[PDB]
Amino acid sequence: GKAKKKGKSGAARNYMTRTQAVKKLQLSLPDFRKLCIWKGIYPREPRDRRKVNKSATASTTFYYTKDIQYLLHEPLLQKFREQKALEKKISRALGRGDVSNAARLERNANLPEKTGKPRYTLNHIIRERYPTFQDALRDLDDCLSMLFLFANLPSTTAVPAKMIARCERLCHEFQHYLIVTHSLRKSFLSIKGIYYQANIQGEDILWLVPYKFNQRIVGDVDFRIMGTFVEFYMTLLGFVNYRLYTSIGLKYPPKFDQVKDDQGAELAAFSLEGLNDPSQLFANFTFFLSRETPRQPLEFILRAFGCKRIGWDAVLGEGAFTTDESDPRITHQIIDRPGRYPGRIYVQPQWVWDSINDEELKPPELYAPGAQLPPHLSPFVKPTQGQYDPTKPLEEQQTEAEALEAELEDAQAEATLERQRELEAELDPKVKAKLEAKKALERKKKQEAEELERAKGMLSKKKRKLFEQMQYSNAKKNAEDAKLRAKRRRIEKE
Amino acid sequence: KAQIKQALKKLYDIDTVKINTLIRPDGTKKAFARLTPDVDALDIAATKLGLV
RNA sequence: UUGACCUCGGAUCAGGUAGGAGGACCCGCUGAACUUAAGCAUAUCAAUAAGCGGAGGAAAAGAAACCAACAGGGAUUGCCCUAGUAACGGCGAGUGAAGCGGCAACAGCUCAAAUUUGAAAGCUGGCUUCGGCCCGCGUUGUAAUUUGGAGAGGAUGCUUUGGGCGAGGCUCCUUCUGAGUUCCCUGGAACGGGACGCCACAGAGGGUGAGAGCCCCGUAUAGUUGGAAGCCAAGCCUGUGUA
RNA sequence: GAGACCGAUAGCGCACAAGUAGAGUGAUCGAAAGAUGAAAAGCACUUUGAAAAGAGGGUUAAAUAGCACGUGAAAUUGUUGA
RNA sequence: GAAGCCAGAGGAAACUCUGGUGGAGGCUCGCUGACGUGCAAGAUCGUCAAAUCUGAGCAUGGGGGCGAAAG
């Protein structure tokens, strides 16, 4: 019988601390972070951190040993070492003055600043992370959120301007794929931006794109982590677009006319050729779009659901079907300002989003300019019994106590027995019926409370602790709901 | 003992409760494999071992 | 702040090398005594044995800071005489060469010392589709030219070229190649005796029941079959650059 | 490949399961020991004997060749005869 | 069988005796030579060996003369 030591088996050689992993790999912390981000390696919670490492605190991060083995066997680490040696060589050449050799060594070093592409090829990494196009589609949500954010963000040292341009390119190509295949489904406006949900091969992809302003950047936000994420998501989205285009039959990449890009076409700078219910909403229509309106979102929506003839002001850029506002061959015009051509339907953009939302042409006279717009709903929360729904009415979603209380409000808008007997010796129908109803309901509530107290006493210690936690959570939920229907009540009385 | 158990299970389909091993004076190893109660040593010896 | 160069380190870094055995002969180091003779001592044994280090099919030496004194010879090595001569030794015990001369065998060369300076022209890697791509070493000197019975540089006019296949051949293993088991006697068994023959560029040797050229393997000369690797080579393709 | 060599006390210590058996703590020391017969044809069967073996019988040219085996001296010994 | 302790009796005390309790000892039982000193014609005093038994592991010092040793 071997006398095995205490901490030499089990979780000890199952998990490894972050410092131990970094020392084993012989990496700088930035390099370890980049490799973990690219490979999707994440910290784990062991069952007992003391058994894993007797000197481990509550703030110690633990990493899987087999994941550290994958990192050790990754070829990208040898690539990193080669790049570091090369950078030392350029430093040597520049410090001595050999400008031509420095330029050649940079050409070999393949920097994102000049190429516009990520410095490292991540083909095998993406293949092993998502061996299925379904998995690629399943993480496109975060991928697209990142690329739209950085396509709107300015340029940094970690994130080159050319790489911003390539992110914008990839976002536009993905938008064209959505336009052509009509796989965009639903949209929503928020105080955070615009949320788009599309359905690609049965997979729902949801992403957010900010409003076009100077997305303010404050605080200790580090763009190197974001830069690594952007690089990975750029390669991922490039392959997703390639596969989607070769599936539809179109040619990838679509031609990019730098000229029309210069006069600012964005989506209209791409011509997609081939290889040798949703699309009826606005097909037989003609849309013209003001200067104050978000051209990129609105154009994306209209081109996704049918409108093939969209025009706008010259300041928005090239690609307008017509720039003349007075043009008599127009159906609808979008404004949000506080020549009044008769043959025209003037609409506010909530009309466009509510039409895309409900798949039914919304009432324009209700959605008319200068009118207090009706509330905008969120096309994302499903009807969940037991939680507030803004669409169903109070009469079928109240609580019984508030119902009786509202009834008595609308109506107004032993001791008595003995005293009446002694004195005798010496509106009303409804109001009464309601007040006896109130006291009877209160009596029922008191009886229920008594039964609940009897049971909660008929629990044990930890069991009752868990039960009290459930009561606290449910009480907070119904309290928020009660606040909601109270505000409904005051809205509806006014 | 672990290899003896694995070989007995994989090849001749014998389940053993335990194994006791010794080294004979001539240099060969002798292993007593005590089997599970479900199986019968006589039946296994007659069928797979060819021993009467 | 950064970056060079110098020096010194790390790596289970990429690729390699050394140890041990054998030691008959060979190259070095170290190093006795017994014995012999002599008043004594040096000497002799012996620059040996024992011990230590280092190579090969040979080793080592080797192309004069030589021999010589002639009419001169001409790297090294080994044999013959030189010669028991010169020479050193109580001119004891004793020790003890070499030049010449005859033979065997023969073969000559490379660097450092000059500046390519009108062009580091050189070389190690490792990446290769093999065709060429980069990392470097190196100017504190890698190529080409020259090595003192020489040489360089200019001028001059004659004279010489370089690669790739390669039929075939030589060397060595292997296949095959003559003739009595004729008759009689002794004998357990003829391979012995007698008779009549045959082969022989083969009458060496061995086996077979006794001394066998002709029973068997073999043995002699010429070929003949297939294979092995080195070397040579008729011819045939090419050549190139003011080299 | 050979020899005016030696021929089992010779020739290498070793013609053989010889650097073996064996001795020494160890460095080391270190032997003895070849031959039936052409061919095992190495004696079937019978008898005595506990067996070992013996006697008939048989193999072979020979058992005056029986695996204590070619030939088989002397020392020494037994029987027989003088 | 010694120190130490207790009690009785004399001594002003220090002590002395007796009776004990105690169980420490370079204490017992079982089966000489070599020198040195000598202060004389040799006396006395000192020094040197004889150094728990035993299994398994381990280390060290070795001759002579010279010299104060250091060497």
Add this chain to the structure above:
RNA sequence: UGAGCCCGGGUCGAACGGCCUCUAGUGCAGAUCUUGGUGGUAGUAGCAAAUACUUCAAUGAGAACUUGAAGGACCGAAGUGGGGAAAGGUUCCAUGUGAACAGCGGUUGGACAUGGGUUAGUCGAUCCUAAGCCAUAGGGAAGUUCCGUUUCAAAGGGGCACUCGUGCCCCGUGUGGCGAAAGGGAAGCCGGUUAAUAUUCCGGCACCUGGAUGUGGGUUUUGCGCGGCAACGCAACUGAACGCGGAGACGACGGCGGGGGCCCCGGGCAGAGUUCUCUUUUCUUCUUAACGGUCUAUCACCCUGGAAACAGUUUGUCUGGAGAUAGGGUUUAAUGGCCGGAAGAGCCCGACACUUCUGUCGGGUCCGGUGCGCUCUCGACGUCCCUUGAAAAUCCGCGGGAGGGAAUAAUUCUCACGCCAGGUCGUACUCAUAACCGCAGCAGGUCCCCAAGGUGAACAGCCUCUGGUUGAUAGAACAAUGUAGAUAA
């Protein structure tokens, strides 16, 4: 003449001779010659001590030394007994043989031949270091190698970090290995079983170490639990780096006390033995493991209180205002008591069975006493010494506060239960007047464990219980002598 030469008879089987030259390892009575073989002495000397053997039967061709029974002797717990260390190596065990060995024989053997036999998480090795030694850094040496062991060695670790700038921090040496089958050390007991193995096989009942993980329980919206004056108590009741401590870890002797075994004495049950006579008689059985639960305490420590008219107290000593006596409590526990184990076991006795595998059923296994007795362990006290009494592996606690949270739960809780696993090597036998060494199967040497009783003053002598011998070449004649040396008779 001679050294010699030739022929005959027998044996035998394969080569040999004469003549003239050539050649040499060429001629034997000696050398206390070499090797081998063989004699007389000579069937001679001789074949020891451990007192000692005898009768019947069986096996066998054969019996003093083969076996069974009986008789007489012996070792006498300081063994002629039961086991180990070292060393040996199959000698152990079953069957067969009797060519050689066992100074005689042999049916016997440690012989020879053929088969078999050694079962482990708990027993050792494996792990740790001790005295000591070896490599590495360096330095000598012509060199094989020597000095050197922490040295003028860049020698070893660990942590932190939103990826702000691909860094920055601390901590400490002799930086490794060897050296112990008696030192340190996690954990297994009882019964039964084979021809040969038993803490290993089977049955019953346990334990330890390591890992993974769930339930219950504890804490938590007062953040990390309560009680007691205190000694401290409990089912667990945050705790990083860093630091401290404990155990491992320890001398010899003396008497004293506690406890467990052994010895002794008595009663009771069952059986056996003597018995002319006597002996309410003599002997034997009457046992209870690991592990778990519960109860049990000297030392020590705490509270009240305050002592000389000094007290307490041991076999002895000593202790006490640096807190005694006294009163009241806390705490360290085993080989102690009770229960489970566990009577179902082991042992004793009786009855019934009869081709075999071999059985079935009844009863009992109880109660005391004592000690200048023996032995193991524990405890307080005293004395002495070379005077704080080896080291390391390993386990635990404490200080310090870095960090840390739970609303269809969190938990860095050493609590209960649940899950999994535990490899390698040795295991036979002897350990000696036959298994080791000594030239050997030698009256010799060789380390340790256990250790009954009677007579008896006795640790003097003698004799028995358990266990083990009857073995030293045997028969006939007589067998109790002689000499020498010691010894206070």
Add this chain to the structure above:
RNA sequence: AAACUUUCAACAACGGAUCUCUUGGUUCUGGCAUCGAUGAAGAACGCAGCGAAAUGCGAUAAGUAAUGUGAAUUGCAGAAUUCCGUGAAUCAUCGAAUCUUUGAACG
């Protein structure tokens, strides 16, 4: 007279001399140049149907692959080989392999 001692002869013993033989030694001569970290020389343990030693080999273990020959090995046992054939053999050659523990011996 027998026995005993001695002598001569025949047979039989003991012993291994002589003669004969020799898959051995010894000496001379000739051609050639070839150990080892790609793990040598040496030591150890295993491997055959029945083997102790010598020999061969290394868990692919008296051996595998390839080439050549052409019908065996042998003590016994059991299998072959169709022989008009990739094919026996304790066969030869030998260019591919297997190659346990140490040993310069190297975690």
